[PDB]
Amino acid sequence: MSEKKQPVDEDNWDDDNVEDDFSNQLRAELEKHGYKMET
């Protein structure tokens, strides 16, 4: 049986695990070390 309208052609909680969302994401803490060394 066909009712064709489809265009030719875990993964529930894990996408926002490393995209940019921590202070060490891609750059290695350098985004804060400009203002991290004052202490």
């Binding site: 049986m1 066909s2 009712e3 309208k5 489809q6 052609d9």
Partner: protein, 145 residues
Amino acid sequence: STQNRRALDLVAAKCYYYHARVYEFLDKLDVVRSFLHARLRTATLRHDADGQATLLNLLLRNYLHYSLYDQAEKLVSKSVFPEQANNNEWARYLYYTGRIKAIQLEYSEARRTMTNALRKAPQHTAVGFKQTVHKLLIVVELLLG
């Protein structure tokens, strides 16, 4: 008592898939709506198997395809009980009835019948509407809980 009626009803359903394709190749099919209403009326009285579900599936598809009241008209349409639809028409019936439940802010009573409809006939590979039902499926789940 020769019961060719339901076999010819399946024949009618198969050609009315393409006839509904004709009816979207043209304007509305209200004459066909009256005809299938008469076919339902002569169904459920003398014979009722596998024709009624197909014609009401056509009815739901035509009613959702147009933006009219169309829905609580079905909610009071108390032919809600066609029998075993050989695991094929029943699943798409559950899909239509779940969407037409979701259209008035369903409250997780429709998510379970959406899941049941999805898992009930998944055997075909890219059947034609599986992407649509899967897309609509977890709308209500991300909505509610």
